[PDB]
Amino acid sequence: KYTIGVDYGTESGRAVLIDLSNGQELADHVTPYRHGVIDQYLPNTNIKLGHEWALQHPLDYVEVLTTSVPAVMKEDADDVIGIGVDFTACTMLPVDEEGQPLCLLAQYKDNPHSWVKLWKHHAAQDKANAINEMAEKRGEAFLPRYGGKISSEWMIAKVWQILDEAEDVYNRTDQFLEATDWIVSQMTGKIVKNSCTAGYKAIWHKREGYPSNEFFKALDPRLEHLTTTKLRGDIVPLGERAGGLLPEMAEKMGLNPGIAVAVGNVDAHAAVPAVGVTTPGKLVMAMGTSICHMLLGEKEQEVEGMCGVVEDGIIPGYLGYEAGQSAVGDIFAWFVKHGVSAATFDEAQEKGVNVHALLEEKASQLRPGESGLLALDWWNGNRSILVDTELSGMLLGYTLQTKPEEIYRALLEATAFGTRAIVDAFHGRGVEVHELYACGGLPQKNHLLMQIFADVTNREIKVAASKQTPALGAAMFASVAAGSEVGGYDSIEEAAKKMGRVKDETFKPIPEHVAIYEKLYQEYVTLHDYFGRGANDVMKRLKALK
Amino acid sequence: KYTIGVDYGTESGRAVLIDLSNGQELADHVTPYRHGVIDQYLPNTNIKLGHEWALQHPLDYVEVLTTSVPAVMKEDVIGIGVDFTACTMLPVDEEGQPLCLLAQYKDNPHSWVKLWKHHAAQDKANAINEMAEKRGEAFLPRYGGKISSEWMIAKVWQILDEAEDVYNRTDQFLEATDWIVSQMTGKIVKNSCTAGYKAIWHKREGYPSNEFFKALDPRLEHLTTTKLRGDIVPLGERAGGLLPEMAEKMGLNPGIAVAVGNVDAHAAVPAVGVTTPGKLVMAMGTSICHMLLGEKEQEVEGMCGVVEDGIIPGYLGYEAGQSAVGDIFAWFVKHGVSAATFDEAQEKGVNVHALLEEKASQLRPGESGLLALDWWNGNRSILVDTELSGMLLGYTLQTKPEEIYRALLEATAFGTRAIVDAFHGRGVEVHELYACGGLPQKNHLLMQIFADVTNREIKVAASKQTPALGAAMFASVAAGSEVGGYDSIEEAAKKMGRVKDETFKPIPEHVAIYEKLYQEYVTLHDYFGRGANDVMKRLKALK
Numbered sequence A: 001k002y003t004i005g006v007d008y009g010t011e012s013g014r015a016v017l018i019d020l021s022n023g024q025e026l027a028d029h030v031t032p033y034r035h036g037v038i039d040q041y042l043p044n045t046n047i048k049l050g051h052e053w054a055l056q057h058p059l060d061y062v063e064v065l066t067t068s069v070p071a072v073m074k075e076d077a078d079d080v081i082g083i084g085v086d087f088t089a090c091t092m093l094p095v096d097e098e099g100q101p102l103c104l105l106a107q108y109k110d111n112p113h114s115w116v117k118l119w120k121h122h123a124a125q126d127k128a129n130a131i132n133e134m135a136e137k138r139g140e141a142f143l144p145r146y147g148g149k150i151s152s153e154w155m156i157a158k159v160w161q162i163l164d165e166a167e168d169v170y171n172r173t174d175q176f177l178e179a180t181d182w183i184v185s186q187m188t189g190k191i192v193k194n195s196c197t198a199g200y201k202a203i204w205h206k207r208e209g210y211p212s213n214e215f216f217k218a219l220d221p222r223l224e225h226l227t228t229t230k231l232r233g234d235i236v237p238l239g240e241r242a243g244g245l246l247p248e249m250a251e252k253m254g255l256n257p258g259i260a261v262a263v264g265n266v267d268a269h270a271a272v273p274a275v276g277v278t279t280p281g282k283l284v285m286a287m288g289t290s291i292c293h294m295l296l297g298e299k300e301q302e303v304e305g306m307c308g309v310v311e312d313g314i315i316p317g318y319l320g321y322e323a324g325q326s327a328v329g330d331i332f333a334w335f336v337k338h339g340v341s342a343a344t345f346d347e348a349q350e351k352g353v354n355v356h357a358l359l360e361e362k363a364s365q366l367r368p369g370e371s372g373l374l375a376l377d378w379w380n381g382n383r384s385i386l387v388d389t390e391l392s393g394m395l396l397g398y399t400l401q402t403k404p405e406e407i408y409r410a411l412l413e414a415t416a417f418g419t420r421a422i423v424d425a426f427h428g429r430g431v432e433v434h435e436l437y438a439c440g441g442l443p444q445k446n447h448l449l450m451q452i453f454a455d456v457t458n459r460e461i462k463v464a465a466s467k468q469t470p471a472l473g474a475a476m477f478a479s480v481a482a483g484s485e486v487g488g489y490d491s492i493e494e495a496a497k498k499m500g501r502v503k504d505e506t507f508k509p510i511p512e513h514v515a516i517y518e519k520l521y522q523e524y525v526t527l528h529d530y531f532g533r534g535a536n537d538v539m540k541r542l543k544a545l546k
Numbered sequence B: 001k002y003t004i005g006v007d008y009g010t011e012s013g014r015a016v017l018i019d020l021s022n023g024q025e026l027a028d029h030v031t032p033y034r035h036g037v038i039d040q041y042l043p044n045t046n047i048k049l050g051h052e053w054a055l056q057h058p059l060d061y062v063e064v065l066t067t068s069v070p071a072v073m074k075e076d077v078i079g080i081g082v083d084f085t086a087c088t089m090l091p092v093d094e095e096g097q098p099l100c101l102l103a104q105y106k107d108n109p110h111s112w113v114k115l116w117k118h119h120a121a122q123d124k125a126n127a128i129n130e131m132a133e134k135r136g137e138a139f140l141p142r143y144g145g146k147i148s149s150e151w152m153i154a155k156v157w158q159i160l161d162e163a164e165d166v167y168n169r170t171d172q173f174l175e176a177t178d179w180i181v182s183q184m185t186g187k188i189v190k191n192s193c194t195a196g197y198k199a200i201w202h203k204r205e206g207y208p209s210n211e212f213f214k215a216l217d218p219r220l221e222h223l224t225t226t227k228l229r230g231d232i233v234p235l236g237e238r239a240g241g242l243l244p245e246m247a248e249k250m251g252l253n254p255g256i257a258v259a260v261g262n263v264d265a266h267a268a269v270p271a272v273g274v275t276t277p278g279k280l281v282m283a284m285g286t287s288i289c290h291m292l293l294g295e296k297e298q299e300v301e302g303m304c305g306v307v308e309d310g311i312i313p314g315y316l317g318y319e320a321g322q323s324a325v326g327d328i329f330a331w332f333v334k335h336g337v338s339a340a341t342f343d344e345a346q347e348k349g350v351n352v353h354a355l356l357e358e359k360a361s362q363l364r365p366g367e368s369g370l371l372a373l374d375w376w377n378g379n380r381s382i383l384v385d386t387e388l389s390g391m392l393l394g395y396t397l398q399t400k401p402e403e404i405y406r407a408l409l410e411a412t413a414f415g416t417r418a419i420v421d422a423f424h425g426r427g428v429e430v431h432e433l434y435a436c437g438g439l440p441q442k443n444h445l446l447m448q449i450f451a452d453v454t455n456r457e458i459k460v461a462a463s464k465q466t467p468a469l470g471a472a473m474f475a476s477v478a479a480g481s482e483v484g485g486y487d488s489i490e491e492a493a494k495k496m497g498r499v500k501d502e503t504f505k506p507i508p509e510h511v512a513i514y515e516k517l518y519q520e521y522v523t524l525h526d527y528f529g530r531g532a533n534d535v536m537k538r539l540k541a542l543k
């Protein structure tokens, strides 16, 4: 008895058939988008794309289904009770009355604004700016729910750009859709929007709904009624049944028609249940280029600098919290490409090892505090708790003897202090954090990072055991949408007890370490506040010169 | 006519022959100290010099004279002079020979020459300052509020506290620069420079009172009139005539003028043509020694010291310094510059430092977006705090090697501005800058940044052996105008002071950007080093 989770990424999509009793995947096949990311030119044309543009081809999404789901079936029958997907969040596209992408229409095929706008599409920053300006000026209740910053990557700004720069595309649009919802509408035939994206990317709230009709009007009179027209529809919680798989699609996929299809999920949020978290007190960290911190709570609290909070946003029956750490994995990448000497590089090749690996081993010989170094993990600004892109990195404690492995550890330590700033911001507001859960590739290749993390927050850290976490998550909600009656489950908690996967070995704080780090952290907090809360804005002035 | 200048460094002494008519080097020879730097085990023995110990062998200095001077002659002279490293002392007997040369004392490491690098006397120095503070000793200010572990007193106190037998057997402690000149003339005459900057000597008031030293240790009362006794004579004064059996062994006429010993940094001032106030001389190298002249003694925050006749007779000579400048750049190449940059320099067949200067060279002030506190090795001037560390601010995912290299170059220019500004606006004015060392020769970008940050024109040393020329210039003054020399260092410099025709002038728009960056520098400089946040010290503690 299994379900299928289709994990749609930035470059490719992949299907995984997961066993509904243990959570193991016996088969997965990834289908790359044959148009990939459209950042240079529209599919086989010479219509150049402006600055900060990211687009994608709608059909590549359906092709993952008509290619990968069949392939996974090959490697077994009608014991596939359901299918679900996770998508990169706020990857929207405008569709017609029949629910098809405008980019597929004769007239619109050549207007860039008719295509899919990838999450990475940052072209609408100015609109995101205005939306935040008006919300501030107006004093809108939703503003603090997103830390006082609606991203350019999200829905409202993205549609407003279309309206302005391409009004003909706007009016032609019957409804704008998150790619996660659109994709399920192609397997089900109906449009049913999930709670995760509406909540985190479309300024939605379960109790107040969307912002006032007056709020949008004050952005552009045309935008009044947007919420009841181009963004109309019931918001339904994760795990619910979008509807049945269409027979014509079922044929193309190797699946039976009518089987349960869950409402779209988001790649990051989908990780929470895949790692067994379906209750408060446990923070989940999707760790990689940066970290997306997610946490469940029983009450709504306006945590400083959080990215968002929404009921049924992550786990039905709980408020979902999301926070973000701007740069962690990127900082280590930066340091290897621009900050580590050739000597350590030679040393690494000298012993047949990768430099990252050599740097980790050498820094693990150091005792916390031994380097005498302290850093502010702000190489790429700050999102959570400080919400300021106008901040830079700092390294302190240099002596003529400072070594690359020492400064490397400082960067590791700095990111952990950054994570702690976030965990304390929640905990100190009632949104408790007792345990840490890590998923991603970072906790795989870098054990030292996980130990510093455990030492600094003084909390036990579990690591995901699944290879394809987001996919498992999708598979999990697929079973919940299926139901107990057909072999699946009646709740994500129940589904989590048997499907959730964490590695048996966890990282535990070493009291001797937790003690040194407590002191190093206090020094970090102080500089964090000095350089980031107003006393000295030198960082901002340094940028203005650059 | 010609005089010889002998420049004794930390590992080698170099003899140079210069033309008293224009101060042009025409021959020079360098002889490395046979026993180099004694700092692990005493010469062939298992005597481990544990701790921050640094000794040296006294004959290695005379070995220099009896090698390089004869050499320079083969490859007349009116006089000779020397410039030595600052506060490299040794105890001698009534014959003026070092105790380490005595069979029954060589094994004790406290009978050897204590090199300036010797830092094992910190505590004795801490006690000095503590006592000096508790007493309100008027000399403490003259040295920026902190006497060094490298200087004479702390060193003589360590010897007493630890090897009281060496102290008692010691007839007199002497500065190497004073000792070496004694070997040439048989007369022991102590110069004002080393007595002033080290040994707490003041021209008008003299040494600190007997009570002060007594207050340190009863045994030290009278130190000033026994083990450190002696008249202090100003630079350029004739120490005596060369001894008969010294001259033949050196290949020079006996009786020639042998000027009182000089110090490498200080002797650089007249060599660059500076002999009056308003002109700051920077001997720029691994670190930087800032030297300035003035008429009225002024208290200046964080100065190393100020002494009448300490540099040029008839003036108050001020000294300030920067812990690390060249060392920071070196630390960067060795531990902070990416292999990518290393490769590029290689494929282009040029030093990585050179590539880094060129790439950094293309940026405009403020273009890097970086700011640094040049305290990798703490700071000496104006703050006088060994317990401070470096900082780098402004990193982004796109920061590049040459950008942080630019920030470091700039950080050291800011540190120098702090120094010059401490002098200026305090009475001792700085209208011009003069630079010596390798950096002025090896890094033009740094010279221009200094120009733009300090907003002062900068002239560069024209000689290749600036210190040697200085010692040589003084040698001429010590032989008078009667036999081919000068009656003063002023006249001598009017013709021997060498400065390159090409000077670095401040570029208006650059000074404006730097006036901006400097203020940011000052804010952090005060935040991290003046009391608001002592995280550097606490961070050091957890080390």
Ligand SMILES: O=C(CO)[C@@H](O)[C@@H](O)CO
Pocket (backbone or CB within 6 Å): A087, A088, A089, A090, A119, A266, A267, A268, A292
């Ligand atoms: O919305 C998100 C992050 O919350 C996802 O689309 C990520 O894949 C973006 O990197």
